[PDB]
Design a protein around this ligand. Structure first.
Ligand SMILES: COC(=O)C[C@](O)(CCCC(C)(C)O)C(=O)O[C@@H]1C(OC)=C[C@]23CCCN2CCc2cc4c(cc2[C@H]13)OCO4
Ligand SMILES: [Mg+2]
Ligand SMILES: [Mg+2]
Ligand SMILES: [Mg+2]
Ligand SMILES: [Mg+2]
Ligand SMILES: [Mg+2]
Ligand SMILES: [Mg+2]
Ligand SMILES: [Mg+2]
Ligand SMILES: [Mg+2]
Ligand SMILES: [Mg+2]
Ligand SMILES: [Mg+2]
Ligand SMILES: [Mg+2]
Ligand SMILES: [Mg+2]
Ligand SMILES: [Mg+2]
Ligand SMILES: [Mg+2]
Ligand SMILES: [Mg+2]
Ligand SMILES: [Mg+2]
Ligand SMILES: [Mg+2]
Ligand SMILES: [Mg+2]
Ligand SMILES: [Mg+2]
Ligand SMILES: [Mg+2]
Ligand SMILES: [Mg+2]
Ligand SMILES: [Mg+2]
Ligand SMILES: [Mg+2]
Ligand SMILES: [Mg+2]
Ligand SMILES: [Mg+2]
Ligand SMILES: [Mg+2]
Ligand SMILES: [Mg+2]
Ligand SMILES: [Mg+2]
Ligand SMILES: [Mg+2]
Ligand SMILES: [Mg+2]
Ligand SMILES: [Mg+2]
Ligand SMILES: [Mg+2]
Ligand SMILES: [Mg+2]
Ligand SMILES: [Mg+2]
Ligand SMILES: [Mg+2]
Ligand SMILES: [Mg+2]
Ligand SMILES: [Mg+2]
Ligand SMILES: [Mg+2]
Ligand SMILES: [Mg+2]
Ligand SMILES: [Mg+2]
Ligand SMILES: [Mg+2]
Ligand SMILES: [Mg+2]
Ligand SMILES: [Mg+2]
Ligand SMILES: [Mg+2]
Ligand SMILES: [Mg+2]
Ligand SMILES: [Mg+2]
Ligand SMILES: [Mg+2]
Ligand SMILES: [Mg+2]
Ligand SMILES: [Mg+2]
Ligand SMILES: [Mg+2]
Ligand SMILES: [Mg+2]
Ligand SMILES: [Mg+2]
Ligand SMILES: [Mg+2]
Ligand SMILES: [Mg+2]
Ligand SMILES: [Mg+2]
Ligand SMILES: [Mg+2]
Ligand SMILES: [Mg+2]
Ligand SMILES: [Mg+2]
Lengths: 177, 136, 98, 48, 48
RNA sequence: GUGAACAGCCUCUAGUUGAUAGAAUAAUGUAGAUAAGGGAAGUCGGCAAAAUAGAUCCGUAACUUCGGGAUAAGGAUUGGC
RNA sequence: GCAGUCAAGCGUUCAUAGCGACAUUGCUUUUUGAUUCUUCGAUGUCGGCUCUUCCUAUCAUACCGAAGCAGAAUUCGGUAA
RNA sequence: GAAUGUUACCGCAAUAGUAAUUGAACUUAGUACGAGAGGAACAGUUCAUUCGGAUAAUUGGUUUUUGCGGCUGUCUGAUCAGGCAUUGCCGCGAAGCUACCAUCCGCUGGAUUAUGGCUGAACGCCUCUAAGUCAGAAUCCAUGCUAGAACGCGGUGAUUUC
RNA sequence: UGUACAACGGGGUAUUGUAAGCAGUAGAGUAGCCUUGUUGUUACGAUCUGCUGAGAUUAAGCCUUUGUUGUCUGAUUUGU
């Protein structure tokens, strides 16, 4: 099955394919959340630790934290819940859901790194992707730089350059509160 | 089996011998089906012919639309109750006996099958495949 | 090769073993053996049958060290900053004061 | 040894087992190994 | 010795169970080494 | 005692413990039972066998000599404290 | 009851592919008759159930030959129980 | 099962019995043939029927395991633990037995019949036949399988002293 | 007279479904004495809970055993 891995430190992510029930089999009878030692899956990830966060079975239905079961069921879903986006106020819709217990019927595991193993992984530890947006509300700037209500934000706001072709520009948020 | 049956059926335990009455589980008008024969079955002094999942029987309707009564038609067994074994090693059984009325070509007479359906039957007859909700 | 569980008792059903009941509404019940199966036909309620997983779960039996603490967490702290905004002049201006 | 060289297909097929039942045969066996049984059962009034 | 169960993928191109698992029954015969203690030489006669 | 009860089942008083005996538990029997799925297809014929059953309450058709048919049919309920 | 020989006919034409009149030779002994030899100091009468075995004048199945056998289907005949 | 010296082990094989059966689907192929309507088969494969011989991992049936639990009635002052009710009744129930109600297995050489042939005279020609001969069937004989002749047999072991 | 055999005992395997005993602030409730209760107290109550997947049974044609205890020459017959 395909593994979809994330390094939530660097914002990095890359997918890996694994064909070998034995290597896979570590993930079986494991729930979402449960941690997993690396070497069992590959020599690459040795002493890497994996958190199981979800994934989609074949036919693409998603998992749902804490159903338990390693199958599918048809839950009633609401506002503010996984695997569903209401189309209308107070709308609820019955929908098939994959369990949160990993079977070999999954198309994809979704995983998140928690400890870094002994070796670097190419598109993950090596590369780092910047956070897209910066602090916009007053005291959030004051806490991304630690400032006290003295230092005055206005000059501590982020500043994102950009080019018009021959006119390079400058645009900062709009501090609120 | 015979006509319209594309595929081979692996032997499955025989549940419905002649005289068995099964639930009619389509929407043609018929409430039950009375088995009078089982297509493609053989002979032994005193042995009653018996049908199983995905067998074509010959039936009459005992309870149902008067248009469907007093006459003999083909029908197909879709649910069993007498447990049988599959090759993956499981012994399973339905809660009722049910067939659906059909023509020699194995095409249904009704536009839907009400209840679950046996895979061994779904595999065997396309239009029984078509009209199915839950299979097996 | 999947191992199933007993929908009445909750015991592992290794392959080709016990029996399978397809109810009229197409809910599928599996039994490890004829014992679960008869209680089940007998409309017995697993939660009241003392030797069942489902019973034991509900009466909180034996569980003990599952409610015992663990050790799973991390410690990161790596800044990326903000895309297009010179992630270099975001740490030298991030020298703080209080 | 066989007295003829069967070509069959059925003979010739080279099996390789996947799992061998090893559960008790003195009753409705539920457990492959004592390991498995301790695993599932938990701790008992004998035991440690 | 006795019997048990086996699970294995079937390889019969043509069969509805090609590349599917099957469960099949098996016997086991206890088979320690046999030990050689003599040779006996037969001859052909018109009596057999 | 239980129960409508001189019923059946258990007991007190009294009376018995008489009926050749031992070892095995093959076939076929005699008598007593159970059996998946089907449900009279068996058979001259449902022969045999199985099903039903007490009570309290609800409900009860044709037809009739008006007396019945009627426990018609069909239902629910029932321990212990 | 079953099978022949002759061949006038039938079969668009063409006796004999398949049939076959008028005649005529046979076989068979699950028909029914004719007989009265055995049993009247007694050989248990019909049908079914069960079960074995035999016959072949073969319904199916193996391999053939023929056709008024294009194919498909059929029909006739052989070795065949 | 007496007797062929005794006893034991391992074998031979006379004679006798003998077994497998039928179907469909796929593919061939919408092919051959046919104006068309229609419409095959051999090779390959997957299942099936009827029959047989076993077997009991599994599933099911059986229950005096009177094994565990439950229930009525009564009897042992109560409790505990029991008795009786032609096995009191009920749910589960191991083991054994057991079912196309369950699983597994059912061999391949030869010789022939019909029939189609080769060569080929009788009969300078012609002919499958007369001599000689090829191919050939759910047949037959073997192979295989079951008995083993208690008056068929072989090899081998050990063979008694108060 | 020995990886001998047997009777028990122990361990496994299995079947049932939680033993007896004690305890409880569980229990529809109920009585009895007063010092008439700012839990009054002593008991009683089908049933429930805990010790307790406990207890019981498990070769009579299950498996196994470093323990315990015991057994180990009676009878008849056979020769080319
Ligand atoms: C008309 O029927 C009878 O006569 C019957 C019977 O009585 C047979 C009954 C005999 C006992 C009493 C022994 O059952 C009798 O005398 O049988 C004779 C008889 O009785 C023993 C034997 C006979 C004559 C030779 C064999 N045969 C068979 C039985 C029988 C049956 C009949 C029959 C005569 C026989 C005789 O006529 C019609 O069907
Ligand atoms: Mg604002
Ligand atoms: Mg309906
Ligand atoms: Mg009959
Ligand atoms: Mg449709
Ligand atoms: Mg059972
Ligand atoms: Mg049962
Ligand atoms: Mg007297
Ligand atoms: Mg007497
Ligand atoms: Mg029955
Ligand atoms: Mg009925
Ligand atoms: Mg009848
Ligand atoms: Mg009827
Ligand atoms: Mg009849
Ligand atoms: Mg009559
Ligand atoms: Mg009649
Ligand atoms: Mg009667
Ligand atoms: Mg009954
Ligand atoms: Mg009347
Ligand atoms: Mg009436
Ligand atoms: Mg009440
Ligand atoms: Mg003439
Ligand atoms: Mg002509
Ligand atoms: Mg003419
Ligand atoms: Mg006649
Ligand atoms: Mg006379
Ligand atoms: Mg006469
Ligand atoms: Mg007479
Ligand atoms: Mg006489
Ligand atoms: Mg006689
Ligand atoms: Mg003959
Ligand atoms: Mg003949
Ligand atoms: Mg012509
Ligand atoms: Mg011929
Ligand atoms: Mg014959
Ligand atoms: Mg003969
Ligand atoms: Mg002797
Ligand atoms: Mg086609
Ligand atoms: Mg034409
Ligand atoms: Mg059993
Ligand atoms: Mg009891
Ligand atoms: Mg007490
Ligand atoms: Mg008494
Ligand atoms: Mg009595
Ligand atoms: Mg059989
Ligand atoms: Mg020969
Ligand atoms: Mg020639
Ligand atoms: Mg010839
Ligand atoms: Mg010749
Ligand atoms: Mg000649
Ligand atoms: Mg043959
Ligand atoms: Mg051979
Ligand atoms: Mg053989
Ligand atoms: Mg002999
Ligand atoms: Mg000898
Ligand atoms: Mg407990
Ligand atoms: Mg015995
Ligand atoms: Mg000890
Ligand atoms: Mg002793």
């Amino acid at each position: 099955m395909k593994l979809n891995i994330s390094y939530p430190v660097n914002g990095s992510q890359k997918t890996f394919e694994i064909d070998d029930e034995h290597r896979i089999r570590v993930f079986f009878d494991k729930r979402i959340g449960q941690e997993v030692d690396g070497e069992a899956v590959g020599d690459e990830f040795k002493g890497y630790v994996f958190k199981i966060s979800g994934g989609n079975d074949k036919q693409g239905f998603p998992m749902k934290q804490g159903v338990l079961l390693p199958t599918r069921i048809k839950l009633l879903l609401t506002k503010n819940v996984s695997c569903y986006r209401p189309r209308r106020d107070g709308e609820r819709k019955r929908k098939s859901v994959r369990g949160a217990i990993v079977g070999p019927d999954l198309a994809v595991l979704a995983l998140v790194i928690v400890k870094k193993g002994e070796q670097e992984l190419e598109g993950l530890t090596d590369t780092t992707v910047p956070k897209r947006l910066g602090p916009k509300r007053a005291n959030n700037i004051r806490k991304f730089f630690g400032l006290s209500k003295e230092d005055d934000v206005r000059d501590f706001v982020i500043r994102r350059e950009v080019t018009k072709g021959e006119k390079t520009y400058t645009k900062a948020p709009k501090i609120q509160r | 089996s015979g006509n319209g049956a594309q595929g081979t059926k692996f032997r499955i335990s025989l549940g419905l011998p002649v005289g068995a009455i099964m639930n009619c589980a389509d929407n043609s008008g018929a409430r039950n089906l009375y088995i009078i024969a089982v297509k493609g079955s053989g002979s032994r002094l005193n042995r009653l012919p018996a049908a199983s999942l995905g067998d074509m029987v010959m039936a009459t309707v005992k309870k149902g639309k008067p248009e469907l009564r007093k006459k003999v038609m083909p029908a197909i067994v879709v649910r069993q109750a007498k447990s049988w074994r599959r090759r993956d090693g499981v012994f399973l059984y339905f809660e009722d006996n049910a067939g659906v009325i059909a023509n020699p070509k194995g095409e249904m007479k009704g536009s839907a099958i009400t209840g679950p359906v046996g895979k061994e039957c779904a595999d065997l007859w396309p239009r029984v495949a078509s009209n199915s909700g839950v299979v097996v | 090769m999947k191992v199933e569980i007993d929908s009445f008792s909750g015991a592992k059903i290794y392959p080709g073993r016990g029996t399978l009941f397809v109810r009229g509404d197409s809910k599928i019940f599996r039994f490890q053996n004829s014992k679960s199966a008869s209680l089940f036909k007998q409309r017995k309620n697993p939660r009241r049958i003392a030797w069942t997983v489902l019973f034991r779960k509900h009466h909180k039996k034996g569980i003990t060290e599952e409610v015992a603490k663990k050790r799973s967490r991390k410690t990161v702290k790596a800044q990326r900053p903000i895309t297009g905004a010179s992630l270099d002049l975001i740490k030298e201006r991030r020298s703080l004061k209080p | 040894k066989s007295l003829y060289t069967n070509t069959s297909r059925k003979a010739l097929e080279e099996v390789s087992l996947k799992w061998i039942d090893t559960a008790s045969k003195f009753g409705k066996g539920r457990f492959q190994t004592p390991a498995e049984k301790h695993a599932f059962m938990g701790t008992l009034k004998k035991d440690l | 010795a006795g019997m048990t169960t086996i699970v294995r993928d079937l390889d019969r191109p043509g069969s509805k169970f090609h590349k599917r698992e099957v469960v099949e029954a098996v016997t086991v015969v206890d088979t320690p080494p046999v030990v050689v203690v003599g040779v006996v030489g037969y001859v052909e006669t018109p009596r057999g």
